[PDB]
């Protein structure tokens, strides 16, 4: 099966990643909350083409994972379901490159939530804001950030960014992949 | 000092417990947020008078936490000033009856919370929603609410309650604590 810790991290991913309207299922208005949300935030910064653009990505998204743990037909993905399908691919999986490809769309699109600026880095302030307005608790930001860059060894760029959601999603233990949750290992 | 997981947990309480408006202060401002949460819902099923009391008793409790944690005189409490203050009791306390005066009211504010139904009793419904309506990562309700219930032997009242928010301000190791954050030990 999955452990505690495992099933603690994947909860973490259904609520916070994809069940934006909270009620315990994944549905195609979470994703257009996605939208509003993106909409909301970019306004005018970002032209019809590229809300288009960024909606075909997330139907593509939606269409990915319905078809792989919408078990029973229904259109809703549940919790359960949602859960299924993760120890399914735990149960095989061994870098980035294996996760299902729904996955593919949901790192970029966290990527870029994080990164405000553009460059494809998350710095600090980014990271503290990653912390604040996505409600985790953050006791000491800096030192969180410190496992993330590993001491300045390594830039909080988006192959960083696939690496911890990877393990974020699939490690028995506490590690990197918690940054992600806003905590140090 | 307190290690990593107790200043998680100390976070998580500053956060949920008292910084109602996320401006990552507590001032009194988050006391009437609780205020305003506490007619929002109740409405006219309380009278005037008591919510005159409640309003008391809030503002009895910022006036002890106020007093204790508030260093510099500001009437603003600080994430730093309120991780000092924990230290602080953590370094001397023993049983619940040893925590300053200020969570002798935030014990039982919380717990009237959680008790949707007023018996005195948080069942599982109760705390299912608990875990909801607070955005926590319950991801088998039942088991976390077995660790606290302890299969049953225990009753999930305000004296099962209190020991479990001492827990959660103080053990240096995860334990039954952990269940008000919504996770197993
Ligand atoms: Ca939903
Ligand atoms: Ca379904
Ligand atoms: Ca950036
Ligand atoms: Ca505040
Ligand atoms: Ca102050
Ligand atoms: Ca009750």
Same mark, same amino acid.
């Given at each position: 099966?999955?452990?505690?810790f495992?099933?603690q991290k994947?909860? !973490?991913?259904?609520? !916070? !990643? =994809?069940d934006?309207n909270?009620?315990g299922? %994944?549905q195609?208005?979470?994703?257009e909350d996605?939208?509003?949300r /993106?909409?909301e935030?970019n306004?005018?910064? =970002?032209?019809?083409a590229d @809300?288009?653009?960024?909606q075909?990505?997330?139907?593509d998204?939606?269409?990915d994972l319905?078809?792989?743990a919408?078990?029973?037909k229904?259109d809703?993905?549940s919790?359960?379901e @949602?859960?299924?399908?993760?120890?399914k691919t735990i149960?095989?999986?061994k870098?980035?490159?294996d996760?299902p490809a729904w996955c593919?769309?949901?790192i970029?699109?966290? !990527?870029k939530g994080?990164?405000?600026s553009?460059?494809?880095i998350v710095? =600090?302030?980014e990271?503290q804001? /990653?912390?604040?307005?996505?409600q985790?608790?953050c006791?000491?930001?800096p030192?969180? @950030?410190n496992? %993330?860059?590993?001491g300045?060894?390594?830039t909080?760029? =988006?192959?960083? /960014?696939?690496?911890? /959601?990877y393990?974020l999603?699939?490690?028995?233990?506490?590690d990197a992949?918690?940054?992600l949750?806003?905590?140090?290992?």
């Amino acid at each position: 099966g999955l452990n505690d810790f495992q099933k603690q991290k994947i909860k !973490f991913t259904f609520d !916070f !990643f =994809l069940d934006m309207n909270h009620d315990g299922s %994944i549905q195609d208005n979470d994703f257009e909350d996605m939208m509003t949300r /993106y909409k909301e935030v970019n306004k005018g910064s =970002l032209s019809d083409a590229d @809300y288009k653009s960024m909606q075909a990505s997330l139907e593509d998204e939606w269409r990915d994972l319905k078809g792989r743990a919408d078990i029973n037909k229904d259109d809703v993905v549940s919790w359960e379901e @949602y859960l299924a399908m993760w120890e399914k691919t735990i149960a095989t999986c061994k870098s980035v490159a294996d996760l299902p490809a729904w996955c593919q769309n949901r790192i970029p699109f966290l !990527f870029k939530g994080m990164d405000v600026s553009g460059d494809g880095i998350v710095d =600090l302030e980014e990271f503290q804001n /990653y912390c604040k307005n996505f409600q985790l608790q953050c006791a000491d930001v800096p030192a969180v @950030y410190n496992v %993330i860059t590993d001491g300045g060894k390594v830039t909080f760029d =988006l192959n960083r /960014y696939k690496e911890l /959601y990877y393990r974020l999603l699939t490690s028995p233990a506490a590690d990197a992949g918690n940054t992600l949750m806003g905590q140090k290992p």
